[PDB]
Structure formats: C-alpha cells, structure tokens
Symmetry: C3
Subunit: 127 residues, 3 copies
C-alpha cells in the first residue's frame, strides 16, 4: 500500500479510520457528513447547505492527497429521504456537472450523528 490523508480542512477522523487512503494512483475517501472541520458542529439549515458542507469536506480530502474532483470516478450518496434528491443534485452539479462520475443514490434508515446526507467516493488519476 502507500499513504493516508490527514487534513484540518475536513473533519478529523476520530475513531479507527482515516479520511482517505491513497494506494498507487487511487484514492478511497471516507463517507463525509455535514460537519464543520473547525468547530466540529453539525450544519443545521437547508439540505443544500448540508450537501455543500459534505462536498466541501470531500473536496478538501481529495486536494489534501493531490487529487481533485476531476479524478473522482465513483460516488455513493446516502440520505434519510429521497425527497432530497432534486436539491442534493442541484448542489452536487456545481461540483461534478462537468466531470460526471458514476453514482448510486440510496436512502438508508439512519446516518452517523443522525445526519440526513453522507457522501463517499473513489477517485483515480493519471493515465
């Protein structure tokens, strides 16, 4: 294997896991929740604001390991309700509208800290 990503620009991986793991030209990013990296608190407001935070956390992790949003190949969005699909996609498009990685969008029963949105991703670069 090769290296782990630790950045203060995304929430600290408190437990037995890392924000991301880089092996060769591939990065595996941990599921990001709407937590502010500096205050450690949950963003409380609209689903667009929560999705913005999640994608900002994801972006910071990619960039901390030498990756970018253009390197992302597969994304998985977890939510507590499909009612958020349209609005989540609206914010999502502002990050991946040009790039367009593969994706699955599913609604689970419950997320960490009782959040409503969580997004993980796999990225690959070079060629």
């Amino acid at each position: 294997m090769k290296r782990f990503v630790e950045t203060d620009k995304a929430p600290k991986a408190i437990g037995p896991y890392s924000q991301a793991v880089v092996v060769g030209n591939m990065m595996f990013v941990s599921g990001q929740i709407p937590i502010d990296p500096e205050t450690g608190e949950l963003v409380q407001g609209t689903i667009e604001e929560k999705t913005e935070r999640v994608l900002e956390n994801l972006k910071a992790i990619l960039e901390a390991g030498g990756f970018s949003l253009k390197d992302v190949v597969k994304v998985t969005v977890f939510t507590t309700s499909m009612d958020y699909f349209q609005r989540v996609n609206e914010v999502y498009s502002r990050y991946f509208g040009d790039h367009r990685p593969a994706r699955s969008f599913v609604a689970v029963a419950q997320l960490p800290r009782n959040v409503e949105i969580e997004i993980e991703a796999i990225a690959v670069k070079e060629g």
Copy 2:
C-alpha cells in the same frame, strides 16, 4: 482518467452523473433501477421481472464500454425488503452463476423513483 459510457441500451443518466466511468482496465457502473431504456417507464410486475431489467441495464452498460459480465468483480444489491432475496438470486444466477463476483446484498429504506431493487457494480478486465 480515461472515459465515460453513454448508451441508449440503458436508461439515460439525466442528472450530474454517468452510466459508468472507465479508467484504465476498470469500470465503475452506476446503480441501475428497473427502468426501460426506450420508454423511460418503471417495470411494474414481479420482482424477477424488475431484477431482469436492472441486470439487462447493467449488462448493456458493461458491453457499451467493451466490458462483459465475466469482468464484474464486485456487485452491491440494494432492496427495500429481504423477502426478495431468494427470487432476486434466482434471476441473478442466470447472469453471474458461472462468473460469481464478490457481493453485498442489503435492504435500505427507500430507492430512487420508489423502486424495490437497485444494483451497482465494479468490473475489471485484462490480465
């Protein structure tokens, strides 16, 4: 990175995502739901008929990018109920009975368009 897959033989990726993304010898396919690629409507009938459509969509995407079902290494089945396990496996075996990729089968709270079955996959070819 390398290339994206767009085919009329699987449902059109409407939003900010692609049906699949091919990077090197790897393909990351988006979660497929029981939608007919030509009419755009949800298959309404038995769970075998819905699983058939999902796997046909998956197969079309693989084949549109130069991949096949034999290249599939990991699959993830999402459902709304585990009651469908036996019957989903029955149809699934007709596509991957010989090949036998790694798999996770989980039941979530809700899926896009309120469907009951969704299947994503990762494929790798060559050697």
Copy 3:
C-alpha cells in the same frame, strides 16, 4: 481477471457469489455477517461478539487469498442501528487501529438473515 477465494474459515458463499475476488493486486471481499463458518449458525449475544465474528470472517477471507488486514484500504459497515457505533468501533479498533483504512458506517433497514451488522471491504497490496 485473475482468481476467486474459497475458504472453510469463513462462511460458505452458498448462492451466485464468491467470498472474495482477487484481480491483480486487489481483493474485493463480500459483506460478512455474524455466522460461524463451522456450524453455519448466527452468533446470538452482544454486538461486540457479532462484530468479532464478522471481522474474523473478513480476516480469514483476506488471509485465504494472500492478503492481510494491513492491505485493507476501504471498509463499509452496515448496521440496523447507530446505537451500536461506539461498541462496534471498540472491536473494530482491535483489527484496524494501527492500519486505519477509509470507512463509511451506515444504518440500513434490514440485513441478510435479519442480522444487525455486516461489513464488506476492498483491499490492495504490494507497491
């Protein structure tokens, strides 16, 4: 592609899937549930005991294909309740506290055999 993993030290993959699939230097492990590989029965007791069984099954599969826990890059934990987070992490740390792979921890509606914990993983080795 390259090879499949079959070991009596993890529960037998009964249906149309394999315990894991090794392609090149990568392994894709199937979601493991708290089943005893020898008796085929569900571990019934505390969530720590169930997590131990799941991680023991995962470990056996990795080791049967020439991989180890240090090779694991991405893990996905599925549960029926987030109430188990702290205790699952406690047992999880005893397997991946040093290594620290990327991770997502989500709570779904239902799991196979009505279990409360299921863990899948991707591993990569060499360099």
